[PDB]
Every structure is written in structure tokens, then in C-alpha cells.
Amino acid sequence: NYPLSIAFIVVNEFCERFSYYGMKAVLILYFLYFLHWNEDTSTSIYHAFSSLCYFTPILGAAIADSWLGKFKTIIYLSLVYVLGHVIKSLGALPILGGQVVHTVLSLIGLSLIALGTGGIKPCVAAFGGDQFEEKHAEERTRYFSVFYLSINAGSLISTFITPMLRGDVQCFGEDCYALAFGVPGLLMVIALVVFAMGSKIYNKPPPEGNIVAQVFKCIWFAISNRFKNRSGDIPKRQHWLDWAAEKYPKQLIMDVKALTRVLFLYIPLPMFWALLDQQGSRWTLQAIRMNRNLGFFVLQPDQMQVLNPLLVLIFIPLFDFVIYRLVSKCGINFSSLRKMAVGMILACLAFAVAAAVEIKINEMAPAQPGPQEVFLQVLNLADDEVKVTVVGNENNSLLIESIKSFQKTPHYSKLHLKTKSQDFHFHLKYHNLSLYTEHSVQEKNWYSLVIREDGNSISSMMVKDTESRTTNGMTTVRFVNTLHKDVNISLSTDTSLNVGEDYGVSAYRTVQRGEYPAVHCRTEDKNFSLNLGLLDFGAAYLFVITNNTNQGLQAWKIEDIPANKMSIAWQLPQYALVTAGEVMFSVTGLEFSYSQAPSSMKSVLQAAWLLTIAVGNIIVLVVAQFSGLVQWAEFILFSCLLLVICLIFSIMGYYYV
């Protein structure tokens, strides 16, 4: 009967942690691209939710167990857990009335899901242990060992799958986040059902969750009496717990004294969790700026998180089977609390790499306009070379260029404005002809001056250009119709476009990457097909439609903007380091808490263990909002900040039993 005894719980954890991580994998992007929040506001809310996901709900969970019991609270909390998920999915639906409802509705979904996740976590994990007596200690330890693998197993599939649905389905919108949250949401229902099937297997224990509350009362009772009395003559009885000895039994006081000693080690911990929890919130914001194209399948920005769960699955049992055997062979002193000390080092070292990676992004970043600074390109469609002089408001030649027939300037020549908006007299010369052409310009934007020809005469048409190849991170097309007839274009089954006559300009249209040799299009008179050749990822193309005696519609191909040079693969070293610390810190610390607590006090540390996680994220919240540093500097800040803590932790741990 034992083989079926605990099967349900582990399967429930996999499904349950599948749902949670999948929802939290795309959570950061959902804020940036759907609610249109800025980075600081987007990271703040995300980490607030993660902190709230552990801060209170665990305490509520233990309190719920005080009179309701472990089994029942799982069912009820898991019920509201689903409720928060389904309502969250509704918020992502664009039909629900714009950001006014989405923001308010989503945060309600986030609030409920947070309550459920941390409300069940303290109970479900310990619930499995009670399913069989601890006399099978090795099996009990095995259960927890395999249990932690199951948690990652759910994250692995969920983290890899959910980001795909965020940009692939595009059912109701180009992104369709609703399906991304929906699939995890429905899966949690399966988790609840499977867990419910185990109700007939084991006799659930009665409520006992008064342990955590009682300990807190003793401290409050002890500290208050010492603070108020202020006798001044108190001997070593000054020890606060001795004050509570007046009321509480000696055995309870003795247990708390031993418990308090170990609990000191938890004070410097939360700074470390500020690093691991930053994976999905600030490194994904970094992966956006890096090139995603690869020889393998093109990876989504946040989909890179799959590495962290993946590396945990191979580092375990690799650390236990190999690394720990080697170090113990050279020295056995390391098979102790010192493991956690090194864990803080690697994460601190991991961010140091992130600073190095971040620096290179800025170095490889292309030139950008700025305040009273504008980027201008010039394209010549005249049959012969045209000489162009950019005469500013001072009558001085701000820039001088000469462009042959059907050619463009190699780069967006930068220009400096005297105001946010300004006009410049772009003098033109064509054969013996000359003309002063004036167009308006604005700061912080790209501009393309299209010199157009009318018979032997020429004119110009200023076209505003904006970065539209990295924001969408997908191939984009652009069309100019020099004909005196509008041209209807069926770009694909997902998009269609028409270009106005007389050098009409179309808007940026995103298209699927691939070859398009037979794009169907119809003029005002007859149908036609155009060959565009290959279109690459992350590149924008501008096509000029011209009349041809034989081809009819003749299209000239020009690359509007190239792609980035920094490959996303360069982010792997970060996860290799930080995940190495996690497996060497999270796992060992968890077993340290369960085993080092006094008798029957294990529940207190399990509560304290998650608290330091919650407090850890809040540090990221305040730093991410009220600090104001440059990102490359922030990773350095955490790297050195944690390094100091590691010294404090190691020094503190050195004197522990």
C-alpha cells in the first residue's frame, strides 16, 4: 500500500508549481508590453507580488492550521488559489475595456494567487511527511529529496512552454497574454483534483499550528516585562527569556533558548534571496536588449529562464555524488554550514558577471538621438545624382551630402536642434536645377528625407522614422509607392496593406520571418505578384514600388535597419553561477532548518525560512524604486553588498554549535 500512499502529493506539487512558475514567467513582460508600465514600476510591482506571495500567506497558513487542520486548509486555500488564477486570465483579455480595468482586475488576480501559493506551501510540504511514520527516516529524507526535484520539474516545463504561448498564438492580439495565463490556470484545477483523490488514502492529523504563535507570545511577554520594569539591578537574569520563565514553563523556555541561537543565523540571509529572485524580474529585462536569434530555435526573451530550473536538475545529484565526495576526500570540514557561505559567494560572483555583460550591451548599443538631437537619413529617387545641403536657420550648411540616383546615405547623419522642434532649409541641386526645400524635424527621432522626382524636376518628402525592429523584435516591412496609382497588397493571411499614389508611405507592418517570393498585390488596374527574397529576423526593410515596362510593379529592396550584435547565449554564464549557489544553498539550508530545530519547533524555522525570502524581495523593491542607479552599477551594488553579508554570515556561523 505504501507505493500508492504518497503518489498523489508529489504529482500535486508538480502540477501546482507548474501553474505558479508559468504565470510568473511571463508576468514581467505582461507589465512592460500590455500595461505599458516602465521598468522601475514594472520591477517594483513584480517583486512586491513575490514578497507578498511568501510574507503573509505562510503565517496565515499556519494560523489556518491552528483550528482547521492541514488537509482541509489545502482544499479551501487551493480553491481560492484557482479563483485568483481564473480572474487573472480575464484581466489579460483586451475586450474587458482597456487598461482601466486590466490594471485593477489583474492586481486582484495577483493578490488572490499570492494568497493561495504561500498559503498552501507550508502545509503541503509537511503534509507528505505525515503520510508515513518517520521511522523510515531514509525514506522520509528521500521524499524531501525527490520532492525538491519535483518542484523544479514543474518549473522546467512550465517556464519553457508558457513564454511560447505569449507571442506565438496571437489570437485576439499580437501577443494574446490571456492564453499564457489561462493554461497554467486550468492546470492547477487538475492539481486540486489529483490531490483530492488522496483524501481516501490517509487519516489527516488534527490541527496543531499553535506552535509558531506561542513562541512569538513568549518573546513579546519576555521583552515587554524587561523593558517596562527597568530594575537596573538585574543579574544575568537580564536575559529576556528568563523573564518569561516567571509565567511559561521551564521546558518551553529551554526550547526557545536553543531555538533562538540558531535563528540568529537567519538574520543575514534575506540579502541572498534578493539575488535569486531577481532572475525573472531584472535579467529578463536585460535579455530583451540582447539578440535572440540563434542557429537553434529563436528563443523568446523570458524563455531563457528555463536554464535555472534545468541546471538544478543536473547539479543534483552531481553535487552530492561527485563534488561533495571530492571535497570530503580533501577535507571533511566543508560538509557543514560552510556550504551556505560559499553559496552566497557564487551568487555575489554571478551578478559581477552580469555587470560585465551589461557593460558590453551599452558599448555595442547603436547611436541614438537625444534632446534637441535628431538622426536624419536621405534617400534619392531622382534619375541622376542630387547634391543636398542642409541649410539651417542660421543660413549655414549644417550638413552637405551628394547622393547618386537611387542611393541613400550610408548612415543617419546626426543633427543638433536649437529647440524641441525646428525647420531647416534642405537645399537641393539637380543637373542645372536647384531648390530650397524646408521640412520640420523633432528631437529623439529618426528621419528619412525622400528626394522624389517629377519629370525633370525634383522635390523632397520628409518621412519620420522610429525604432520599430527591436521593440517588436521581429521582421518589419515598409512600402513607398511612387506610382500615380494606389497598390493593394495582400502581405499574408495575417496582414494586408495598400500604399497611396504619388510616393505614398505605409506604416511599419510586422511580418513572419521567411522568404516571400510571390507576395500577391493588386493595383488600381490589374493584379500582380512581387518577389521580396529573404527577410531576416530583427530587421526592418523599406520597399519602393516603381513602374516597369515588363515587370509591371517593380520593387526596390532596402534594409531599413540592421540587427543587434550581442547574442543572448552570453547570458548563460550568469545562470551557471547563480544556480550553482542555489543548489548549494537552498537545498542545504532547507535540510538545516528541518534537522537543527529543537523538538516540535520545526514549524517555527519553516516559517522563518520563508520570511527571509519575503524580506529578501522587499530589498529589491526599495532598491529598484528609490535608488536610481544605472543598471550596470546596480548589479555591482548587489554583488559587493552581498559579499559583505557573506563575511558577516560566515563570521556569525563560525561560532555556532
Numbering used by the authors: 41 to 697
Give the authors' words.
HsPepT2, on the other hand, has been trapped in a substrate-bound inward-facing partially occluded state. The HsPepT2 model is lacking the first 40 residues at the N terminus and the last 32 C-terminal residues, which are predicted to be disordered. Recombinantly expressed and purified HsPepT2 used for structure determination was stabilized against heat unfolding in the presence of the dipeptide Ala-Phe in a concentration-dependent manner, confirming substrate binding of detergent extracted HsPepT2. The N and C termini of the dipeptide are clamped by electrostatic interactions with N192, N348, E622, R57, and K161, respectively. The phenyl group side chain is accommodated in a hydrophobic pocket formed by Y94, W313, L316, W649, L650, and I653, referred to as the side-chain pocket. In the HsPepT2 structure, the cytoplasmic side ends of TM4 and TM5 in the N-bundle are in close proximity to TM10 and TM11 in the C-bundle, narrowing the exit route from the peptide binding site to the cytosol, although without fully closing it as instead was observed in outward-facing HsPepT1. In the upper part of the transporter unit, the interaction between Y94 in TM2 (Y64 in HsPepT1) and N657 (N630 in HsPepT1) is disrupted and replaced by an interaction between Y94 and K161 (TM4), restricting bending of TM2. Additional intrabundle contacts including Q319 (TM7)–N348 (TM8) and Q316–R322 (TM7)–E674 (TM12) further stabilize the partially occluded inward-facing state. Last, the interbundle salt bridge between R206 (TM5) and D342 (TM8), together with the polar interaction network around H87 involving TM2, TM7, and TM8, tightly seals the central cavity from the extracellular space. These interactions need to be disrupted so that the transporter can cycle back to the outward-facing state observed in HsPepT1.
PepT1 belongs to the solute carrier family 15 (SLC15), also known as the proton-coupled oligopeptide transporter (POT) family, which consists of four members in eukaryotes: PepT1 (SLC15A1), PepT2 (SLC15A2), PhT1 (SLC15A4), and PhT2 (SLC15A3). PepT1 and PepT2 are best characterized and mediate the uptake, distribution, and resorption of di- and tripeptides in the body. PepT1 and PepT2 are secondary active transporters, which are energized by the inward-directed electrochemical proton gradient. On a structural level, human PepT1 (HsPepT1) is 708 and human PepT2 (HsPepT2) is 729 amino acids long. Both polypeptides consist of a core transporter unit of predicted 12 transmembrane helices (TMs) of the major facilitator superfamily (MFS) fold and an extracellular immunoglobulin-like domain (ECD) placed between TM9 and TM10.
